[PDB]
Amino acid sequence: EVQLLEESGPGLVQPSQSLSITCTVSGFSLTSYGVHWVRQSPGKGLEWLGVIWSGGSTDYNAAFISRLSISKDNSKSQVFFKMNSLQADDTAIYYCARNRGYSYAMDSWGQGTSVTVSSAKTTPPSVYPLAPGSASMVTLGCLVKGYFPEPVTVTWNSGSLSSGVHTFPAVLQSDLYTLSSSVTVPSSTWPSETVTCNVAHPASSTKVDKKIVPRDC
């Protein structure tokens, strides 16, 4: 009918601890198809972790076998993934995917569950205005530093300024996230007209409206 697989994970895990993910499937039987586990991170791309075949036996990526465990309950249409001793680079999107019988290719994938391995605590961002040095378009910026977890939402002039904006992917710095956003407007509109960076961080329930003011030599 509609072969679906759905992962259910913790989201955030602390390093050295374990990661348990349950893959619930429908539209097909686990007694008829194997189920693979694959993860994706920017640093290692797509990595195959292991699989539990329709018959119940498993196969693991040797690089993970020392801390990976895959099992299942055919009656409940559930496949269980458990990996111990998590480390920072285990941060990634984890997927379960159906094995297409004798083709040995993943054909139906779950949407995946994002896992972040971190010891950080919820922390609001420090917001800093980026105005050009004291010494036609003009580009202004906003630095959002030291927050956790992702995401934060950066807008300009409460969303009234949406064109010419570039909000960059956050990078990890000292267990905390940092990102920047730039906005380019006609030099005739700034600083004659106000330009403000608006930062919202849902997790910490904080918002910061930082006005970009010119520097003074």
């Binding site: 693979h36 791309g45 797509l46 990595e47 195959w48 699989v51 196969d59 693991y60 990526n61 040797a62 690089a63 997927y95 995917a97 297409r100 004798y102 083709s103 040995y104 290719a105 993943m106 054909d107 994938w109 779950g110 949407q111 995946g112 420090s126 800093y128 205005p129 980026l130 105005a131 050009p132 040095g133 004291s134 010494a135 378009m137 580009t139 910026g141 630095l143 530093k145 570039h166 909000t167 960059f168 992917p169 956050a170 990078v171 710095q173 940092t178 990102l179 920047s180 730039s182 380019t184 520097r215 030599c217």
Partner: protein, 217 residues
């Protein structure tokens, strides 16, 4: 280890043109069963990978005929007769012949446009951040093409690479350009040890780098 090498890794294309992606394995993918478990996946932003071709040349359900796979042993090729907007994304070859199963690094099929020089802007640490004891020097290199670019930081004329964090945006859906942010993170004391801060961008659009600087004064 079994290595899957895709070439090219980045493939700019104009809609309507033909595209060809190579995937070579460090060892034959001909399985002992006589079958060759070499498959191709296409992954679009935010989505899970989707099966395109299985067992070298079999088009999966719903895959248009403009997609064709060929090859044998260690050499395989995926061809798109006439690229359409919905074909843009990242293509992965995958082998299910030898455990651990492995993926290629992925080939990014992106929209081609005329080369464009980046608009570079440098920003000194805000007074607010300095008050906090930190000093981030930010540099925006916006709307350039192709994505290949080199950014160098120079403090009082000396190249500095430690403490530099870069972030790149994905291809702009509107003008097909790329943008990047580079930040030189320093302690307030390190910042005060020098005066001249420079952000230098080297891009194929010019034989000479674009230089933006400011003096701590």
């Amino acid at each position: 280890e079994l290595v899957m090498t895709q070439s090219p890794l980045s493939l700019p294309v104009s809609l309507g043109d033909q595209a060809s992606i190579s995937c070579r394995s460090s060892q034959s993918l001909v399985h002992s069963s006589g079958n060759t478990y070499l498959h191709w996946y296409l992954q679009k932003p935010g989505q899970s990978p989707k099966l395109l071709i299985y067992k070298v040349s079999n088009r999966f359900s719903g895959v248009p005929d403009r997609f064709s796979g060929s090859g044998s042993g260690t050499d395989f090729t995926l061809t798109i007769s006439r690229v359409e907007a919905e074909d843009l994304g990242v293509y992965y070859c995958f082998q299910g012949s030898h455990v651990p199963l492995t993926f290629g690094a992925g080939t990014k099929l992106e929209l081609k446009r005329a080369d464009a020089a980046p608009t570079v802007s440098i920003f000194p640490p805000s007074s607010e951040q300095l008050t906090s004891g930190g000093a981030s020097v930010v540099c925006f290199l916006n709307n350039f093409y192709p994505k290949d670019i080199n950014v160098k930081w120079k403090i009082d004329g000396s190249e500095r690479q430690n403490g530099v964090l870069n972030s790149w945006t994905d291809q702009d859906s509107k003008d097909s350009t790329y943008s990047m942010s580079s930040t030189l993170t320093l302690t307030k004391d390190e910042y005060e040890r020098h005066n001249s801060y420079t952000c230098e961008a080297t891009h194929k659009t010019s034989t000479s780098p674009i230089v933006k600087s400011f003096n701590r004064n």
